[PDB]
């Protein structure tokens, strides 16, 4: 996929909720990767539609092929609030399958971004990560492994899940609480990266049995640590959820305060004494512990909402990340 090694993913608005448009040859080439957002649903909750805020439908899979041919991603996003995805029955899976893949085949999409909240959670007696029973999930994985499949080893996918989906899974399994994992753990061989949204998200218990609080330094080391490292479900010490590789975990944060009105925003200053502990491990004086002493070089970067907020906040996201990213000198 010739995607770089620490890279900064962004999403974009198809849409003006206030921050405004931005055409795509507009975006700051300091992303690496373009979450177009969002496909979205009607009646039927599984046909995604999609089609460009700006210009023409032809014109807009040519502003991607030009973003394309200067090395960017750029990534439909399933999700939003327009955008809920239920997948009860294998008709379901289907429309979602087809509907997809003709978008993809229409644009010219590098992959797919799966922002689902609404619609997943695990129902009763699903209690193995490993082998899900849940049809919405287990229907999903299904979906996900056709598409990826379809498109060859190159396909693009990811997904920003928030936190009691996944490192939520430490305190209880059922519910939504842990219901990412099996997906996450279903297409795993598939998956690019994981941005966890770390926002919106009040506090998260890390896998020293410690609360933390969100837009912390300590939060964000402890929640990704659990991707980085693996981490016991449910209070089972026997039932342990598997480190994903280093290059497919990433952290989600919000690229100015107003675009997490629920809290989660975190200082550069303060993230990148994060950032240096988890890929260096060199500690900032937390009173989290990083699982490896070492740490993990191959953290593969930041996600944000949002490419519109980030202009609007006078690029703070991108011209701190990329500087820091760009400065690292890892040797290994
Ligand atoms: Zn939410
Ligand atoms: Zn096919
Ligand atoms: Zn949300
Ligand atoms: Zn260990």
Do not use: C
Not at 88 to 112: H, M, V
Not at 160 to 185: C, D, H, M, N, R
Not at 246 to 251: A, H, L, N, R
């Amino acid at each position: 996929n010739n995607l770089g090694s620490k890279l900064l993913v962004g999403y974009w608005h198809n849409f003006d909720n206030g921050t405004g448009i931005i055409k795509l040859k507009d975006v700051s080439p300091k992303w690496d990767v373009i979450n177009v957002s969002f496909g979205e649903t009607g009646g039927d909750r599984s046909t995604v539609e999609f089609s460009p805020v700006y210009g023409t439908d032809a014109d807009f899979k040519s502003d991607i092929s030009y973003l394309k041919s200067k090395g960017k991603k750029v990534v439909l996003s399933i999700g939003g609030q327009n955008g809920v995805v239920l997948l009860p029955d294998n008709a379901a899976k289907d429309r979602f399958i087809n509907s997809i893949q003709s978008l993809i085949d229409k644009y010219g999409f590098d992959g797919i971004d799966i922002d689902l909240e609404s619609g997943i959670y695990l129902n009763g007696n699903d209690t193995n990560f490993k082998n899900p029973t849940t049809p919405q999930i287990v229907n999903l994985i299904s979906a996900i492994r056709t598409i990826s499949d379809h498109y060859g080893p190159d396909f693009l996918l990811s997904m920003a899940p928030e936190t009691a989906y996944v490192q939520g899974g430490y305190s209880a399994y059922g519910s939504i609480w842990g219901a990412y994992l099996p997906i996450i753990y279903g297409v795993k061989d598939k998956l690019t990266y994981i941005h966890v949204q770390h926002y919106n998200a009040g506090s998260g218990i890390g896998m020293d049995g410690n609360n933390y609080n969100q837009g912390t330094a300590d939060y964000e080391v402890a929640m990704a640590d659990m991707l980085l490292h693996g981490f016991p479900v449910g209070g089972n010490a026997n039932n342990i959820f598997p480190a994903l590789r280093s290059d497919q975990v990433m952290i989600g944060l919000p690229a100015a305060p107003a675009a997490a009105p629920s809290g989660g925003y975190i200082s550069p200053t303060e993230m990148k004494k994060a950032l240096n502990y988890i890929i260096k491990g060199v500690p900032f004086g937390g009173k989290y512990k990083l699982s490896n002493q070492s740490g993990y070089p191959a953290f593969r970067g930041l996600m944000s909402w949002s490419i519109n907020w980030d202009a609007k906040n006078n690029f703070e996201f991108s011209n701190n990340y990329r500087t820091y990213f760009d400065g690292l000198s890892l040797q290994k």
